[PDB]
Ligand SMILES: NC(=O)N[C@@H](CC(=O)O)C(=O)O
Ligand SMILES: NC(=O)N[C@@H](CC(=O)O)C(=O)O
Ligand SMILES: [Zn+2]
């Protein structure tokens with residue numbers, strides 16, 4: 001007896017194309033998405049070249065249109081030089097991503113004044129998302145208030161951060177957030193098994209108390225998003241390991257396991273992987289699109305999932321219950337039981353669909 | 363320059379068929395919906411016969427399929443006798459409506475124990491909505507906690523009620539709510555103009571402080587819904603006036619006026635008339651469906667709107683800015699500039715669409 005779900009949306013993935021295609025490309029990353037029950041992805045801009053101007057956006061759009069197997073939108077990234085220059089292409093992007101801490105990125109902003117400039121110049125009706133850890137959450141929330149607009153906080157990982165956001169929501173402030181599976185299902189207790197290379201990720205893995213605080217405050221979490229951040233094992237275990245975990249193929253099985261245990265409901269899951277991604281990012285429906293899952297099947301996560309080029313996973317050895325059996329995307333079978341059946345290029349940029357433009361005042 | 367909006371959803375309308383068709387029927391009520399930029403409606407069960415058993419549901423479904431011009435779902439109503447009897451038809455309804463106070467309804471529940479019985483027997487994955495005023499909000503919230511499930515509060519009208527819901531949300535409780543336009547745009551100050559017959563409505567009109575509290579707490583309001591409750595003028599001004607206002611044709615023009623004044627944003631409006639109705643009630647997208655509005659057009663609400671058989675309005679004389687120019691429903695022009703162009707019966711029961719069933723565990 002299979003359960004039919006709507007097409008799930010991951011608003012935070014790194015697909016590494018252009019410029020890092022040994023780690024992942026559009027074709028392999030979207031195969032991993034479909035195998036994880038995800039039919040739409042929002043791809044982050046910290047590629048090489050990074051997506052921080054109109055020519056880079058145009059290049060990435062064509063590469064995505066040619067390689068993606070599921071539908072997508074592409075973020076623009078904020079830089080120290082591009083505030084006020086993105087107005088003509090802003091509406092074609094998923095939103096604007098701000099990198100406000102140290103991580104796998106050179107998109108460094110040196111000054112809060114640069115954050116203010118982006119919040120003042122980016123069109124007020126379009127999404128802004130931030131990599132903002134610990135006190136940086138409070139600081140970017142301040143900039144959002146000074147400029148009278150909303151902000152979405154990426155991968156919330158700490159009790160400190162979820163309680164701050166909770167207090168902001170109680171004051172009626174327009175803030176939303178997402179949480180990634182590794183911050184719900186891994187902790188400091190896993191660092192000995194993972195080791196210091198594989199274990200590198202930003203935000204870093206939390207304490208057991210951090211993990212328990214996220215679960216206790218599920219009502220504060222608007223979205224789940226993988227922060228799929230593939231790097232090869234060689235890279236993860238070498239002299240200067242980059243931060244990040246792959247996670248498209250494991251996120252839904254982990255969360256379905258939690259549903260089966262009563263830790264959250266099926267509805268709680270669908271709000272956070274479908275309805276709230278849709279409404280925060282104004283993403284369009286996908287016609288004739290659905291995901292069929294088997295909630296009874298027990299398996300153990302292996303040393304690598306089939307599709308991501310990362311060819312490793314930090315969830316190796318975890319027992320899960322739940323698996324993706326079939327994905328239909330816009331009327332075509334896209335995935336069955338380990339086989340992807342739509343080619344590179346089947347996927348489309350949802351911001352070009354008439355129903356995918358963000359409504360605005362004339 | 364027109365603005366294109368998605369198909370808007372009104373989760374609280376009274377279409378009076380079967381049994382009250384001099385006040386409204388499916389054809390006239392859904393014409394009023396389309397003229398108000400609404401493409402999907404959830405119809406309440408306090409008809410004659412009321413929709414409280416499978417035979418009444420089957421009758422209403424056929425009448426709606428034959429008369430509706432826009433798409434719809436039909437609520438079931440809770441009674442003192444039907445707890446535990448609705449399991450086979452529950453998934454075909456919009457949800458279950460509980461009438462917990464005195465209003466235009468005989469669906470009286472005598473005891474909180476009856477509320478508990480409904481919360482225990484209605485399928486836990488399906489919506490429950492309540493007419494619950496003042497302390498009744500707190501009481502039904504208690505029953506929802508005792509039975510470990512969610513509840514949606516209809517037409518919140520008072521500072522007391524919105525602050526209670528605000529405090530519940532801060533504690534992480536699964537409660538959502540809607541507000542009707544007359545509780546945002548009318549108050550006690552209008553009772554002298556309206557008089558005691560026309561002014562009758564449940565919840566009654568609030569004080570200026572009630573209205574200001576709803577606006578101040580917009581972040582707490584999940585949905586706008588009209589509580590379109592048509593009665594004829596003769597009925598409203600006779601010896602025992604029934605409570606209720608018509609409102610499908612005026613709700614969006616009133617709210618667009620507020621947007622133009624900066625009282626809320628276009629996004630705030632779309633969350634509350636599209637995204638959150640979708641996600642609370644698991645309502646499906648409508649393909650090739652959109653509403654085109656003109657935000658510049660200034661007009662004054664007349665003594666009656668063109669389509670509702672109520673043939674009166676409590677908003678007569680209010681100056682508004684914003685009007686519905688065109689509605690396209692599933693690829694057909696449904697409304698242009700005062701003309702409805704889809705016939706009775708064009709509309710469909712969204713719960714019969716594959717994507718309109720509420721997902722559940724096997
Ligand atoms: N999360 C990570 O550890 N790395 C991300 C960057 C990011 O999201 O910070 C990546 O792109 O590798
Ligand atoms: N709101 C009203 O005053 N009347 C409603 C019933 C209701 O929603 O209470 C009606 O159906 O007439
Ligand atoms: Zn393509």
Ligand SMILES: [Zn+2]
Nearest residue numbers: 103131154202
């Ligand atoms: Zn990040």
Ligand SMILES: [Zn+2]
Nearest residue numbers: 012014044227
């Ligand atoms: Zn990231």
Ligand SMILES: [Zn+2]
Nearest residue numbers: 427707708709
């Ligand atoms: Zn029909």
Ligand SMILES: [Zn+2]
Nearest residue numbers: 465493516564
């Ligand atoms: Zn009511």
Ligand SMILES: [Zn+2]
Nearest residue numbers: 374376406589
């Ligand atoms: Zn009502």
